[PDB]
Design a protein around this ligand. Structure first.
Ligand SMILES: [Mg+2]
Ligand SMILES: [Mg+2]
Ligand SMILES: [Mg+2]
Ligand SMILES: [Mg+2]
Ligand SMILES: [Mg+2]
Lengths: 130, 46, 95
RNA sequence: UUAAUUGGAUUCAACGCCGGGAACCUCACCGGGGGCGACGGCAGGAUGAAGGCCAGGCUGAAGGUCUUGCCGGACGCGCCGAG
RNA sequence: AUGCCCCGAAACCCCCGGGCUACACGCGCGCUACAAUGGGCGGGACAAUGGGUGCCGACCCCGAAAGGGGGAGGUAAUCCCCUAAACCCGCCCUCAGUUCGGAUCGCGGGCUGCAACUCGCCCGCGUGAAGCUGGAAUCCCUAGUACCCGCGCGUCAUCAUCGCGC
RNA sequence: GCGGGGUGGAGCAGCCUGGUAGCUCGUCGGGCUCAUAACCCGAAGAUCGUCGGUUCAAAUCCGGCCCCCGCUACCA
């Protein structure tokens, strides 16, 4: 219980596995996305992760495609996302494969509440507007 | 226990479906301007 | 950023104590001398001023003692907003 | 509360109302990137303006710019008024 | 459609990602219940308005279910949507927070889409919250009308607790 | 002489005749109204100064005590 096993297959046991034999080990949504092909932008992004995986492209990977499905290629490195105004780092670990990329870059600031004002109740609605 | 560890697993990686489990809020995309009032009333003046 | 009635020109900050009557407002500013604000006629219609409302006024170079004149008010979304910037210290309102 | 949580309507006669069940568009809102001056005159222009591309950087992605040099064959927001 | 005043390399025109779906809280209109004037399981009965060529799909075959692979006939009183539900008979439950009530959550399978995390809809197993008839107040209805039960168009690539009709 | 008040933000009930801590001005919410005051309704708020006895069982019977006290004056 220190190694990670997804469906009985270790990381480097599945790291060399294919992409059509892979999808039988993912839930519906990701199996279907892997079956209607990848979008053009995600092609352009995989063709920048693989270079950054061999020896080249030692430069921060950025993106707008929050839809990309994490895969056994991306385990280990640290890529960015775009949560609306800025690029936020997501250090990819195992136990993320299957989830969505944008799933880890939240998008609305947590809310903390002040105090009710003029109109929050029927006792301060017409007693203010004269 | 199995459900609990399936929740902790989402708490680790800091997903979006794990933080809602943290703060005790809806999880499956509901709206909350109007329902889910598990708190206590607030006053202004009288 | 934000458009707030800062001191522009020679403006003053009016935080009133009592309305003696007929529009006279004794104001308690950080300056010290008892100033007595009065009101123009453009706002006497649509707005509603009382005590505790920190607002902006304008003083007059005559005797610099009992002066002030409303030109614009403050809404509850600004009166305490103006604390974090420290543009005004609220302890000129509790002593 | 927020980077933005776009606006109009407040008794009858405002609140499943604007045919408003908004993933993109609709979109008017916050972050970023790029294009647009019929027409009269000005610096300039066949010793070649406006204007376009294989490949590579910057970039979220882009001949959008720059590196690189190829092409096209008359006009000209680099300047003023107008539209 | 339109007068006046501001923008005029921008407040004009396109493209990618976010928001309108944020949540201590007050309110308007509705849907499901608090059970016997009922819940479940197996059988038996009877409609009307409307719509279809970017579309409606009979019939056959795979699947437990959502759905999938083929595919006649239809530019319409011809073919299709389209053997409705409340109702009846037979057996289990017997007044209990229950065989009432199904919110909230975990895992797995699918459809539309250029794209389902923020934020779509549908299926199977599991967990099983408040709720035991509602204070002062207030609304709609005079006959095939009120109440009770289902259906069709609109919006629509998918999604109806809504609007307008039966 | 020594004894009393010991309790919601408060004001006092409320004993002996023991089992709702009780009514009123206040506090926040909702009604009524074109809107405000008055009027109707709902919840929140001390849980009896405290140990101890009685008591099946206590503001409710009382004592011990902690606090506030309290009706009262040089006594040649
Ligand atoms: Mg949009
Ligand atoms: Mg809205
Ligand atoms: Mg049931
Ligand atoms: Mg989704
Ligand atoms: Mg009133």
């Amino acid at each position: 219980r220190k190694e990670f096993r997804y469906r009985g297959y270790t990381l480097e046991q599945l790291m060399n596995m294919s992409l059509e034999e892979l999808a039988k080990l993912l839930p519906a949504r990701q199996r279907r996305s892997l079956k209607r092909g990848l979008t053009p932008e995600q092609k352009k992004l995989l063709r920048k992760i693989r270079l950054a995986k061999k020896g080249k492209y030692n430069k921060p990977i950025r993106t707008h495609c929050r839809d990309m499905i994490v895969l056994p290629e991306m385990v280990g490195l640290t890529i960015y996302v775009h949560n609306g105004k800025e690029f936020v780092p997501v250090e990819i670990k195992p136990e993320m494969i299957g989830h969505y990329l944008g799933e880890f870059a939240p998008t609305r600031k947590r809310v903390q509440h002040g105090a009710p004002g003029i109109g929050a109740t029927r006792s301060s609605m017409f007693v203010a507007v004269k | 226990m199995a459900i609990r560890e399936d929740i902790m697993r989402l708490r680790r990686i800091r997903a979006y479906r794990g933080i809602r489990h943290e703060l005790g809020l809806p999880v499956r995309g509901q709206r909350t301007r109007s329902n889910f009032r598990r708190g206590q009333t607030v006053g202004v003046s009288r | 950023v934000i458009r707030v009635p800062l001191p522009e020109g020679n403006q003053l900050f009016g935080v009133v104590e009592q309305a003696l009557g007929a529009g006279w407002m004794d104001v308690r500013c950080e300056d010290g001398k008892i100033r007595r604000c009065r009101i123009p006629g453009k706002l006497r219609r649509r707005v509603w001023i009382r005590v505790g409302d920190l607002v902006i006024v304008q003083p007059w170079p005559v005797q610099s003692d009992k002066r002030g004149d409303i030109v614009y008010r403050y809404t509850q979304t600004q009166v305490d907003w103006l604390l974090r910037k420290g543009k005004i210290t609220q302890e000129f309102l509790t002593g």
